[PDB]
């Protein structure tokens, strides 16, 4: 499953960076470019909705690094009106990164892997053919392209 493998790579890499604060050195043409986009736009949505995300995290009441089931239902609920766009998708990933950060403060040795798998699952399973229709992450990259 290339699309799943690729989406998880991007999403884990971003969440790990945000949580620990360090980049990783390690097929990545659109991937490196998608992560570049995510870093720029992700930080964008986090910066201006800081109070809202904090509000959402308290409400979410995350216990540990494996307690992702409530975040999963939230993501299903976002999409349940039948509207799909990269704005929503980037906001969810950006929120996961916010959650990852606070998980590293209440431990500092948590795999962010469950969080990333959880986000990638909802995305790729429930929006599979949608993502394929626009060449996966090139769609994401092009939508957030600034000149």
């Amino acid at each position: 499953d290339e699309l799943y493998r690729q989406s998880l790579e991007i999403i884990s890499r971003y969440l790990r960076e945000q949580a620990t604060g360090a980049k990783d050195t390690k097929s990545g043409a659109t991937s490196r470019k998608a992560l570049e986009t995510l870093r720029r736009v992700g930080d964008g949505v986090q910066r201006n909705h800081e109070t809202a995300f904090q509000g959402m995290l308290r409400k979410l009441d995350i216990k540990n690094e494996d307690d992702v089931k409530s975040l999963s239902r939230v993501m299903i609920h976002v999409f349940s009106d039948g509207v799909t766009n990269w704005g929503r998708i980037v906001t969810l990933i950006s929120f996961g990164a916010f959650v990852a950060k606070h998980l590293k403060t209440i431990n500092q040795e948590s795999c962010i892997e469950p969080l990333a798998e959880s986000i990638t699952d909802v995305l790729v399973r429930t929006k599979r053919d949608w993502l394929v229709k626009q060449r996966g992450w090139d769609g994401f990259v092009e939508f957030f392209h600034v000149e």
């Binding site: 736009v41 959402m56 939230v74 609920h77 704005g87 929503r88 969810l92 929120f95």
Partner: peptide, 23 residues
Amino acid sequence: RPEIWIAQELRRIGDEFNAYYAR
């Protein structure tokens, strides 16, 4: 109720982001 509120703020922010970049 809690999950509904979180979903709705993520949706609002996401749609706002969408609208911006779809200029």
